[PDB]
Enzyme design. Structure first.
Site, PDB file in Angstrom:
ATOM      1  N   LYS A  86      26.229 -92.005  -2.785  1.00 23.16           N
ATOM      2  CA  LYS A  86      25.051 -92.565  -3.469  1.00 23.16           C
ATOM      3  C   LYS A  86      24.330 -91.506  -4.292  1.00 23.16           C
ATOM      4  CE  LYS A  86      25.197 -96.801  -1.638  1.00 23.16           C
ATOM      5  NZ  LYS A  86      25.517 -98.027  -2.431  1.00 23.16           N
ATOM      6  N   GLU A 108      15.951-100.353  -4.098  1.00 24.72           N
ATOM      7  CA  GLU A 108      16.163-101.236  -2.974  1.00 24.72           C
ATOM      8  C   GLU A 108      17.114-100.497  -2.037  1.00 24.72           C
ATOM      9  OE1 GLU A 108      18.224-101.377  -5.608  1.00 24.72           O
ATOM     10  OE2 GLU A 108      20.153-101.294  -4.534  1.00 24.72           O
ATOM     11  N   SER A 376      33.387 -92.376   1.654  1.00 28.35           N
ATOM     12  CA  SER A 376      32.134 -92.529   0.901  1.00 28.35           C
ATOM     13  C   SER A 376      30.963 -91.850   1.603  1.00 28.35           C
ATOM     14  CB  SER A 376      31.862 -94.005   0.628  1.00 28.35           C
ATOM     15  OG  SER A 376      31.743 -94.723   1.856  1.00 28.35           O
TER      16      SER A 376
HETATM   17  C1  LIG Z   1      27.998 -94.545   3.079  1.00 26.98           C
HETATM   18  C2  LIG Z   1      28.125 -95.832   2.316  1.00 26.98           C
HETATM   19  N1  LIG Z   1      29.357 -96.201   1.875  1.00 26.98           N
HETATM   20  C3  LIG Z   1      29.564 -97.358   1.169  1.00 26.98           C
HETATM   21  C4  LIG Z   1      28.526 -98.223   0.875  1.00 26.98           C
HETATM   22  C5  LIG Z   1      28.836 -99.500   0.129  1.00 26.98           C
HETATM   23  O1  LIG Z   1      28.196 -99.550  -1.170  1.00 26.98           O
HETATM   24  P1  LIG Z   1      29.089 -99.439  -2.494  1.00 26.98           P
HETATM   25  O2  LIG Z   1      30.066-100.563  -2.339  1.00 26.98           O
HETATM   26  O3  LIG Z   1      29.795 -98.096  -2.577  1.00 26.98           O
HETATM   27  O4  LIG Z   1      28.094 -99.602  -3.608  1.00 26.98           O
HETATM   28  C6  LIG Z   1      27.154 -97.911   1.280  1.00 26.98           C
HETATM   29  C7  LIG Z   1      26.105 -98.891   0.921  1.00 26.98           C
HETATM   30  N2  LIG Z   1      24.744 -98.663   1.315  1.00 26.98           N
HETATM   31  C8  LIG Z   1      23.684 -99.404   0.607  1.00 26.98           C
HETATM   32  C9  LIG Z   1      23.640-100.874   1.021  1.00 26.98           C
HETATM   33  O5  LIG Z   1      23.153-101.065   2.367  1.00 26.98           O
HETATM   34  C10 LIG Z   1      22.357 -98.725   0.830  1.00 26.98           C
HETATM   35  O6  LIG Z   1      22.340 -97.647   1.473  1.00 26.98           O
HETATM   36  O7  LIG Z   1      21.318 -99.237   0.364  1.00 26.98           O
HETATM   37  C11 LIG Z   1      26.937 -96.685   2.033  1.00 26.98           C
HETATM   38  O8  LIG Z   1      25.709 -96.372   2.462  1.00 26.98           O
END
Ligand SMILES: Cc1ncc(COP(=O)(O)O)c(/C=N/[C@@H](CO)C(=O)O)c1O
Ligand code: NA
Ligand code: NA
Lengths: 396, 254
Positions: A86, A108, A376
């Site tokens: 992120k 958000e 991720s």
């Molecule tokens: C460590 C990690 N991997 C994947 C994702 C999945 O999000 P994408 O598909 O990559 O955009 C998230 C998502 N989190 C958001 C929603 O709760 C949020 O924090 O607000 C995450 O925290």
């Protein structure tokens, strides 16, 4: 009129109240300008390198593939500052906010990782940050709420609707519609109205660019497939983008199967939902038969976005990318396996991608394949959840 | 049908503004909502704007968010809202009935099919809250094919291009939300549907002011809902307060 195409085939668009259209057009113009500006690119590169820690490692996993013809690499976004991917695109969006002369950030968050990334970027760059978070999410993510607050951000609980991520998404749009002259909406995934799916992809695409350079250096060829979890789509499109034109490279996105697709308790709208229009876009949705938006269920907090980015829906429709699901129990096993065999504690979101790679390996153990999983995030945040499950079962 | 055209012609004959209340269908229940709506009409509403409860009303403030919650608590569905619309029209043949909708509810079972059902039950217009003119083509086309006016918002940050588009695309009325005189005279210049002012209309003086500025009338976007919220424990006092309010607001349109 826009500068860029707002659609990916039939998916995407700008389905917002008319009042918000100037904010979207302003943001698109600023982005287009920024992408041609060497000064903007240099500032972004400097933050990525010297603040966030890029480039991130590409780790060959030494133990988990033993006795098979799979070679598995993990792209280590878990090592980025903040502990997830992120951080990359928040730094770019915070710079766009400054480019537009905004002093305030709205974001958000569901699990809280995007909220933390928004807060840290806002603290570094001198922006006043407010974060909307569903009241149910605030209650269950006190650690992340506290980090955001330590970093000087205002966290605003949202009690409307289901008191979860979608409701927080609505509230952020409501605020922005009134505040856009001074505030930027720092949307956390590759979804929402144009130009966000485009911006978020371009500000995450270093994941795939680095992966390509690293895998070439180490193996002398491209991967057979790259594999990423899909909540709203940002980490996956960040890994995919630079490989889209490399037609031999598989692009596999993994949605949360929750308790199992057949239970309806899942978060896999791309393959098991229905196209609708919500949150500014036409895309596959979790929704009732009569068109009310529903929540995504997953053991993982971060795979909660109840739709999916329109570029994923498009890539699927044309057959360029393939989308699958992984259940809670499969994700948990992959989590345990990486901790024990590689000494890496993965986010439960990322564990869904790993679980699917392990399935590719185990189902066909004599198939030669070179796979990359996008890791991720790190899974420190998940150890209490995992602890509680393992005790409930009686494994501890 | 020509219900808006006939209403505006009649109001113009009487040198009179339109007053148009908003309420959420099925708030706080189906029965009470039906009674509320008949009270608004009896009290002098010139037309209605009616919301269908939606899970994620991202153009609405708290008053309407809470109205949706009450209607959901009563188990109100879009199908039930359409049964309500048929009954309302059967009781009241000439009053223009406009819906305020979210895009997903229009798209859900097919855009064309949505507008066909609107026509069948006797609806006159639909404002889709999260469809900007830029995305409006399939909605406007389906509306017009089924004798439904597509209603657009002219927002505070409107520019000339937008004024021209809204003037060209809209029918029934323009929902008005850069100098107010500028917008109103520009809309007339461009032969737009008659303008109704919808920003924060909560008192009689605001109705008079809208007419004086050259608008054809005023829409109370949330004041009616606020009266429902305040009087939940007293259905009969609720109706009395609604009557008093609408009477006062309509009197101000002279
Ligand atoms: C460590 C990690 N991997 C994947 C994702 C999945 O999000 P994408 O598909 O990559 O955009 C998230 C998502 N989190 C958001 C929603 O709760 C949020 O924090 O607000 C995450 O925290
Ligand atoms: Na091996
Ligand atoms: Na999703």
């Amino acid at each position: 009129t826009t500068l860029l195409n707002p659609y990916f085939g039939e998916f995407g668009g700008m389905y917002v109240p008319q009042i918000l259209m100037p904010a979207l057009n302003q943001l698109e113009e600023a982005f287009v300008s920024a992408q041609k500006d060497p000064e903007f690119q240099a500032q972004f590169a400097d933050l990525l390198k010297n603040y966030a820690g890029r480039p991130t490692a590409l780790t060959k996993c030494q133990n988990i593939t033993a006795g098979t013809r799979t070679t598995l690499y993990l792209k280590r976004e878990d090592l980025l500052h903040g502990g997830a991917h992120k951080t990359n695109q928040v730094l770019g969006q915070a710079l766009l906010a400054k480019r537009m002369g905004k002093s305030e950030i709205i974001a958000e968050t569901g699990a809280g990782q995007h909220g933390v990334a928004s807060a840290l970027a806002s603290a570094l760059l001198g922006l006043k940050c407010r974060i909307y978070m569903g009241a149910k999410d605030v209650e269950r993510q006190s650690p992340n709420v506290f980090r955001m607050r330590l970093m000087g951000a205002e966290v605003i609980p949202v009690h409307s609707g289901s008191a979860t991520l979608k409701d927080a998404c609505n509230e952020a749009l409501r605020d922005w519609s009134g505040s856009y002259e001074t505030a930027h909406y720092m949307l956390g995934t590759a979804a929402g109205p144009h130009p966000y799916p485009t911006i978020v992809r371009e500000f995450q695409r270093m994941i795939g660019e680095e992966t390509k350079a690293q895998i070439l250096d180490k193996e002398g060829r491209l991967p057979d497939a790259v594999i990423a979890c899909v909540g709203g789509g940002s980490n996956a499109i960040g890994m995919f983008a630079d490989f889209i034109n490399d037609t031999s490279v598989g692009l596999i996105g993994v949605e949360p199967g929750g308790h199992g697709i057949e239970t309806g308790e899942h978060g896999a709208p791309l393959k098991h939902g229905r196209v609708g229009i919500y949150f500014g876009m036409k895309a596959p949705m979790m929704q009732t038969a009569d068109g009310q938006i529903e929540e995504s269920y997953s053991i993982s907090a971060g795979l909660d976005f109840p739709s999916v980015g329109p570029q994923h829906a498009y890539l699927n429709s044309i057959g360029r990318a393939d989308y699958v699901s992984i259940t809670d129990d499969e994700a948990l096993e992959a989590f345990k396996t990486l901790c024990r065999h590689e000494g890496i504690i993965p986010a439960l979101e990322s564990s869904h991608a790993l679980a699917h790679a392990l399935k590719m390996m185990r189902e066909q153990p004599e198939k030669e394949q070179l796979l990359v999983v996008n890791l991720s995030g790190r899974g420190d945040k998940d150890i209490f959840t995992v602890h509680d499950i393992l005790k409930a079962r009686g494994e501890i | 049908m020509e219900r808006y055209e006939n209403l505006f012609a009649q109001l113009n004959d009487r040198r009179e503004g339109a007053f148009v209340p908003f309420v959420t269908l099925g708030d706080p229940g189906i029965e009470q909502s039906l009674k509320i709506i008949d009270t608004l009409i009896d009290a002098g509403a010139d037309a209605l704007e009616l919301g269908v409860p939606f899970s994620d009303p991202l153009a609405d403030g708290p008053t309407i968010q809470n109205a949706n919650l009450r209607a959901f608590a009563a188990g109100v569905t879009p199908a039930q809202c359409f049964e309500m619309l048929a009954l309302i029209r059967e009781k009241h043949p000439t009053i223009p009935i406009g819906l305020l909708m979210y895009a997903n509810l229009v798209f859900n079972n097919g855009i064309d099919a949505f507008y066909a059902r609107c026509e069948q039950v006797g609806v006159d217009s639909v404002l889709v809250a999260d469809v900007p003119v830029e995305e409006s083509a399939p909605f406007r086309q389906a509306a017009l094919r089924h004798n439904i006016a597509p209603i657009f918002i002219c927002p505070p940050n409107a520019d000339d291009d937008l004024l021209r588009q809204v003037a060209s695309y809209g029918r029934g009325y323009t929902y008005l939300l850069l100098p107010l005189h500028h917008l109103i005279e520009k809309l007339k210049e461009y032969h737009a549907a008659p303008a109704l002012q919808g920003f924060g209309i909560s008192s009689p003086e605001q109705v008079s002011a809208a007419v004086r500025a050259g608008a054809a009338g005023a829409i109370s976007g949330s004041a009616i809902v606020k009266i429902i919220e305040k009087n939940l424990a007293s259905p009969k006092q609720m109706l009395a307060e609604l009557r008093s309010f609408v009477s006062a607001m309509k009197a101000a349109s002279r």
